[PDB]
């Protein structure tokens, strides 16, 4: 008796295993990620995070990719070496298992994910999607 | 103040544009699709729906590709042609579209999407994804 869960929290592709995608988060108030692998990974891989802005030419196409300034919450003991956000997948990630997280402070409108240097050879074996919650 | 919406409705790769993978719907009890186009399409694209079964070799690997039959959905004037469940995307659908649909009755452990004969070229412009409503 499954419902049409597409509408009312849809989702979109962000990292199809080959490139990024400027996913919109404007019309929705809450969002998050979901990581999914297809094979074993060689080492601890990591991904950065970028937020976009409505380009001045057309306020519908997202502008360039601006890195996001991650913020800590009464516990972060090791800051991420600067004011950036960077997700990393652990060593023992496995197929038929998914990890999921998000960033609390959204900036701009659009969101994209890019693998940091030294992990692009492994980023070909992972899937990253975004699912929203907001009506607006 | 977004939530970790990853848990509580994850999301996975349904159709990237060049192929499609089965998605597990065992632990989850409600699910649906989210259609999204990347560019202008030329003709109405029709997608065949399939379900898979646990291969007798290993209980958590999908078996072959079996096609789903469709429910008449009583309050309708259903004009099927062979009764095999499928869903198509209407013409003039922009990449700014919230196109979402679902199968009313699930019949297996894995769901998969494939493009039907005729909807081959423009099928590499469609971007399909699936969300869950899981439990258990």
């Amino acid at each position: 008796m499954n419902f049409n869960v597409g509408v009312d929290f849809p989702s979109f592709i962000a990292w199809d295993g080959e490139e990024s995608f400027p996913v919109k988060v404007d019309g929705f108030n809450q969002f998050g990620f979901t990581f999914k692998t297809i094979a074993a990974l060689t080492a601890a891989t990591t991904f950065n995070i970028f937020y976009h802005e409505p380009s001045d030419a057309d306020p519908c196409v997202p502008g360039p990719a601006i890195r996001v300034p991650e913020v800590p919450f009464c516990d972060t003991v090791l800051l991420s070496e600067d004011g950036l956000a960077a997700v990393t997948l652990p060593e023992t990630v496995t197929p038929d298992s998914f990890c999921a997280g998000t960033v609390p402070c959204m900036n701009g409108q659009w969101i994209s994910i890019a693998p940091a240097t030294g992990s692009e050879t492994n980023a070909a074996n992972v899937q990253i999607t975004v699912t929203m919650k907001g009506a607006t | 103040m977004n939530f970790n919406v990853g848990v509580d409705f994850p999301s996975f790769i349904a159709w990237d544009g060049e192929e499609s993978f089965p998605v597990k719907v065992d632990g989850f009890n409600q699910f649906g699709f989210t259609f999204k186009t990347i560019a202008a399409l030329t003709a109405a694209t029709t997608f065949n729906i399939f379900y898979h079964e646990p291969s007798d070799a290993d209980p958590c690997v999908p078996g072959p590709a079996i096609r789903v039959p469709e429910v008449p959905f009583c309050d309708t004037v259903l004009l099927s042609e062979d009764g095999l469940a499928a869903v198509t995307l209407p013409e003039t659908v922009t990449p700014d579209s919230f196109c979402a649909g679902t199968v009313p009755c699930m019949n297996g452990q894995w769901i998969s999407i494939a493009p039907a004969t005729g909807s081959e070229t423009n099928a590499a412009n469609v971007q399909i994804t699936v969300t869950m409503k899981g439990a258990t």
Binding site: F33, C99, A100, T102 | C60
Partner: peptide
């Protein structure tokens, strides 16, 4: 900072390989 909650999808193929002590008689 991203908090990665993660969770498996193939329930429990443990197969502990339960073993009992075999017929051990002495040390002579």
């Amino acid at each position: 900072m991203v908090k990665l909650n993660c969770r498996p999808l193939c329930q429990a193929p443990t197969a502990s390989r339960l073993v009992s002590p075999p017929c051990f008689i002495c040390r002579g």
